[PDB]
Amino acid sequence: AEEVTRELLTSSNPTEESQTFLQLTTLCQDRTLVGMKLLDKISSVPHGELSCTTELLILAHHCFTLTCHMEGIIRVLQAAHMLTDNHLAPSEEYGLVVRLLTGIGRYNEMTYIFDLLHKKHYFEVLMRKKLDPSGTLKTALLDYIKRCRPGDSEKHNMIMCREIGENHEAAARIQLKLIESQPWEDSLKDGHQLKQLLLKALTLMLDAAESYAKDSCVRQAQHCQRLTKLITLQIHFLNTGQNTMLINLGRHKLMDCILALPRFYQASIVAEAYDFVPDWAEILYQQVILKGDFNYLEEFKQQRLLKSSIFEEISKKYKQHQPTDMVMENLKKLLTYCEDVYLYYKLAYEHKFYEIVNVLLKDPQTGCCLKDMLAG
Amino acid sequence: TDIMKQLLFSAKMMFVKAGQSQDLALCDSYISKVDVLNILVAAAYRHVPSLDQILQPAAVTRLRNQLLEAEYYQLGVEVSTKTGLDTTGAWHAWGMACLKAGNLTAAREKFSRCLKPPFDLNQLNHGSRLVQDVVEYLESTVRPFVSLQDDDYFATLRELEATLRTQSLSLAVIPEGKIMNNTYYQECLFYLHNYSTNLAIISFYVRHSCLREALLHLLNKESPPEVFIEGIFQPSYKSGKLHTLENLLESIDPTLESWGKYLIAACQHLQKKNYYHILYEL
């Protein structure tokens, strides 16, 4: 302890002299007695001894921690708070205090200066580079942004992006639910307010997806994006006047929302936002099967793909209602460019539909194989 | 946890003199558990298990699923890997998750580290069934040559409503070969080349109606005469738009030079099944 004090008094990079310090303590047999001696010698600080005494106090934790004498560390923490208050508070040594706080070890327990750094203009100064050799300083900065000082996202960006995404998503959901808290008839009068609220909710959801992206929350960003797309559809509804809407729809109301814009390119939004699965055969019984709007089917086709099994199954949905003579060509509206042999071959017999039968099974190169398609 | 480890070490210290091998095995396992406790402690999750809750295996896979629900793909993945809990399925799950978002380059980079393709070049099956699901999960949402780029943001609610009106123009205008030519199709085929084969590359372009480059690759990949037998005749028994098909078969070699048995084995599948009437034309 005397030698350490003498070397410090003589001294009266920062990561370089750490070894010069430690290798002295290495001379000891069991470091606990050395820690006791160093703690006792710490009281020998000279008049105005600040710079050397900083390293002196710093060594106390580096000693007491590796062996974990809890009471010793407790008195050490008391010593650290005392160094902060009795001397450092009058010393105003910002850099020395910062280095000490870095060397806190129990920097998890640095409440005595935690708000001080922000009050000491260290909040943006917390973004000092080359001060995180192990990266823990920035992590503690993030922890402080989460707990000690929540709200100023600027210092947050300077220093969890998932936390920001969740907060923005919560704000967007609150904005979306505020409109739904009132009746549709009551809320329809304030159309401009609806458009503005939809714009704000869309911005909040976009920020949520972006902060999830900065958080690498790919699926969460996607969910925020789907919420934003629904909010934008409601924004057009409140702005372009589409009182036939789909936003904030329940499962039961999903079919009605699809009925708001029945065509596939017009009906995809309700299914996407509320994760609703339309009755492909039963719903498709009304898209083209009875109306012929295989243009809505083409909206689906450029939007998605329907299987041949669904093609042979849609006959059931068509037969499940009163199929007008129009309904035949209505379902077949998209049948020209098709190729399916076996399922259509069975279906034609299922209804004696000589139309497509003559359409396909007539070509000798094709009507010679219609036997293998149907009777084969 | 440091003191916990030290105490466990002392437990081993007292165990060494004991001479009970089974006791030593139990102690080593408990050491493993303490290490895993520390490993989890590196994460600081919403909830953590008891040691008795860790003293049982089932909870390992329990956490394997839980962290998957916790979206800690990297952290949970590393934890499970240290645990001896494999997470290639979690890698594919992350792949699908970014697929729902579009971190496709990073997703591909992470998935190549966990790529499990079928080495057999004749894989007429899922091969990597992960690829089998991923191909659909990707190609179900093709971005064709619509006029809207992947960087259009400020499109007002009117622009969005006009997009709703014009949505069908994105992929209907995408042509037959454009189904294969898409940069989206480029990515899908790249993933295929990563962990898939042509046996399904034919069908993927088939449901999107990409044929010419499909035949070009089929020759380039040497589609088997049995492949051009089944995947043609059985689809032909299901399609029969073969006006283009016999033409393309001749397009391989009009002089019957480089296009020998591809439809010959299909004719085996047909006439062996006594299907010959249009085999006359073929």
How far is residue B138's CA from residue B259's CA, in Å, rounded to a whole number? 33
Cβ contact B242–A239 (<8 Å): no
**How many separate helices (H) and strands (E) can be counted in chain A?**
24, 0
Q: Which of A47, A52, A50 is nearest to A9 (CA)?
A: A52
Query: What b/e string do you get for B258-281 counting C-beta neighbours within 10 Å, with b at 16 or more?
Result: ebeebbebbbebbeeeebbbbbee
Write a three-state SS string for B200-265: HHHHHHHHCCCCHHHHHHHHHCCCCCCHHHHHHHHHHHHCCCCHHHHHHHHHHCCCCCCCCCHHHH
Q: Which of B161, B184, B204 to mutate to test the interface with A (most CBs of A within 10 A)?
A: B161
CA dist A331 and B159 (Å) reads: 32
Cross-chain residue pair A217–B277, CB shorter than 8 Å: no
Q: Please judge whether A68 and B3 are an interchain contact, meaning their C-beta atoms are less than 8 angstroms apart.
A: yes
* A205's tokens: 């959801």
d(CA B24, CA B264): 69
Task: Classify each residue of A345-364 as buried b or exposed e, where b means 16 or more C-beta atoms within 10 Å of its C-beta.
Answer: bebbeeeebeebbebbbeee
CB contact under 8 A, A299 and B170: no
Comparing CA positions, the residue from A332, A304, A363, A313 lying closest to residue B241 is A363
**How far is A189 from A198, CA to CA, in rounded Å?**
15
* A182 phi and psi angles, rounded to 5 deg: -110, 160
**Mutating which of B99, B156, B157, B249 best tests the A interface, going by the most A Cβ atoms within 10 A?**
B157
Q: Is A67 on the interface with B (CB under 8 A)?
A: no
In one-letter notation, the amino acid at residue B206 is V
Classify B158 as helix, strand or coil.
helix
Provide the 10 A C-beta neighbour count for residue B35.
Answer: 15
Q: At A62, list the tokens.
A: 């580096």
Q: What are phi and psi of A8, to 5 degrees?
A: -65, -40
Q: Tell me the angle at which helices A264-274 and A294-303 cross, rounded to the nearest 10 degrees.
A: 50
Integer angstrom CA distances of residue A374 from A160, A336, B275:
63, 19, 12
Q: How far, CA to CA in Å, does B268 sit from each of A360, B235, B236, B281, B282?
A: 24, 14, 13, 15, 12
Distance CA A347, CA A127 (A): 71
Cα–Cα distance measured from residue A9 to residue A17, given in angstroms and rounded to the nearest whole number: 15
Q: Is B25 on the interface with A (CB under 8 A)?
A: no
Method: cryo-EM
Neighbours of A86 (CB within 10 A): 10
Q: Give the C-alpha distances (Å, rounded to integers) separating B226 from B124, B155, B213, B232, B240.
A: 11, 51, 19, 9, 18
Identify the DSSP state of A30: S
Tokens of A374: 């149907």
Residue B90: how many other CB atoms lie within 10 Å? 23
CB atoms inside a 10 Å sphere around CB A336: 9
Question: Please, what is the Cα angle at B116 between B111 and B121, to 5 degrees?
Answer: 125
CA distance A318 to B243: 31
Q: What count of other Cβ atoms lies within 10 Å of the Cβ of residue A264? A: 28
- What sign for the dihedral angle of Cα A149, A153, A155, A159? positive
Of the candidates A80, A138, A135, the one whose C-alpha atom is nearest the C-alpha of residue A111 is A80
Maximum C-alpha span of chain B? 89
Radius of gyration of chain A (CA): 37
| H or E element that contains A238 | helix A218-239
Q: What are phi and psi of B87, to 5 degrees?
A: -140, 35
Contact B237, A342 (CB under 8 A): yes
**CA A216 – CA A56 distance, rounded (Å):** 43
Instruction: Centre a 10 Å sphere on the Cβ of residue A65 and count the other Cβ atoms it contains.
Output: 16
Where do the H-state alpha helices sit in B113-197? Answer: 129-139, 157-166, 178-181, 183-195
**Residues in chain B, how many?**
282
Cα separation, B80 vs B64, in Å, equals 7
Q: Choose among B15, B53, B54: nearest CA to B34.
A: B54
Residues of B in contact with A68 (CB under 8 A): 2-3
| Selection from B75, B83, B29 nearest residue B51 by Cα | B29
The answer for residues whose C-beta is within 8 angstroms of residue B156's C-beta and 6 or more apart is: none
SS3 (DSSP) at A247: coil
Place of tokens 């050395």: A34
Closest CA to A95 of A51, A129, A34, A132: A51
Classify the phi-psi angles of A85: left when phi > 0, otherwise alpha if psi is within -120 to 50, otherwise beta. Answer: alpha
Partner-chain residue, chosen from B2, B107, B160, that has the shortest CB–CB distance to A232: B160
Q: Which of A199, A265, A275 to mutate to test the interface with B (most CBs of B within 10 A)?
A: A265
Closest by Cα among A112, A45, A119 to A78: A112
- Closest-CA distance of chain B to residue A54, Å: 27
Q: Residue A26 corresponds to which tokens in the numbers above?
A: 């290495």
| Cα end-to-end distance, chain A, whole Å | 101
Which of B216, B219, B192 lies closest to B204, judged by CA? B192
Nearest C-alpha neighbor of A96 from the set A108, A109, A111, A113: A113
Instruction: Give the other-Cβ count within 10 Å of B194's Cβ.
Output: 15
Of the candidates A20, A101, A97, A104, the residue with the CA atom closest to the CA atom of residue A62: A104
For chain A, positions 75-134, list CB contacts with chain B under 8 A: none
Nearest CA in chain B to A266: B164
CB B15 within 8 A of CB B39: no
Q: How many helices (H) and strands (E) does chain B have?
A: 16, 0
How many angstroms separate the CA atoms of B2 and A67, rounded?
A: 10
Compute how many other C-beta atoms are within 10 angstroms of the C-beta atom of residue A109.
12
Q: How far apart are CA A282 and CA A3, in angstroms?
A: 91
- Å from B97 to nearest chain A CA? 5
- Residue indicated by tokens 């048995």: B261
Nearest to A247 by CA among A304, A191, A173, A166: A173
Q: CA-CA distance, A322 to A314, in Å (whole number)? A: 14
Q: Is the dihedral of CA B276, B277, B278, B281 positive or negative?
A: positive
Handedness of CA B251, B257, B263, B267 (dihedral sign): positive
Name the minimum distance, in Å, from the CA of A351 to any CA of chain B: 19
Give the residue from A207, A203, A209, A246 showing the smallest Cα distance to A224.
Answer: A209
Q: How far apart are the first and last CA of chain B?
A: 77
Q: Among A195, A217, A301, whose Cβ lies nearest the Cβ of B172?
A: A301
CB contact at 8 A, A239 and A213: no
Max distance between CA atoms of chain A, in angstroms, equals 113
Structural contact between residues B187 and B122, judged by C-beta atoms closer than 8 angstroms: no
Tokens of B166: 């014009």
Amino acid at A91: S
Q: Alpha-carbon distance A276 to A255, whole Å?
A: 9
Smallest CA-to-CA distance from B165 within B143, B184, B138, B146 is with B146
List b or e across A230-261, with b for residues whose CB sees 16 or more CB atoms inside 10 angstroms: bbbbbbbbbbeebeebbbbbeeebbbebbebb
Nearest-CA neighbor of B158 among A376, A97, A238?
A: A238
Task: Please report, for residues A73, B8, B88, B103, B107, the alpha-carbon distance to residue A216 in angstroms, rounded to integers and kept in the order given.
Answer: 39, 38, 19, 9, 11
Residues in chain A, overall count: 376
CB within 8 Å: A341 and B277: no
Q: Which residues of B touch A298 (CB under 8 A)?
A: 168, 172
Please give the DSSP secondary-structure letter assigned to residue A375: I
Contact B101 A240 (CB under 8 A): no
Residue that the structure tokens 């296009």 belong to = B259
Are B127 and B195 a contacting pair, CB within 8 Å?
Answer: yes
Question: What are the structure tokens assigned to A262, written together?
Answer: 């029945």
Tell me the shortest Cα–Cα distance from B253 to chain A, in angstroms.
21
Name, in order, each residue with C-beta under 8 angstroms of A106's C-beta and a sequence gap of 6 or more. Answer: A61, A73, A77
A360 CB neighbours in chain B (<8 A) are 240
Alpha carbons A203 and A172: distance in angstroms, whole number: 8
Two structure tokens written together for A225: 């994006």
Question: What is d(CA B274, CA B282) in angstroms, rounded to the nearest whole number?
Answer: 14
The resolution, in angstroms to one decimal, equals 4.0
Is there a contact between A355 and A309 (Cβ–Cβ < 8 Å)? no
Q: Determine phi and psi for B169, rounding to 5 degrees.
A: -85, -5
Q: Are the beta carbons of A56 and A8 closer than 8 angstroms?
A: yes
Q: For A130, left (φ over 0), alpha (ψ -120 to 50), or beta?
A: left
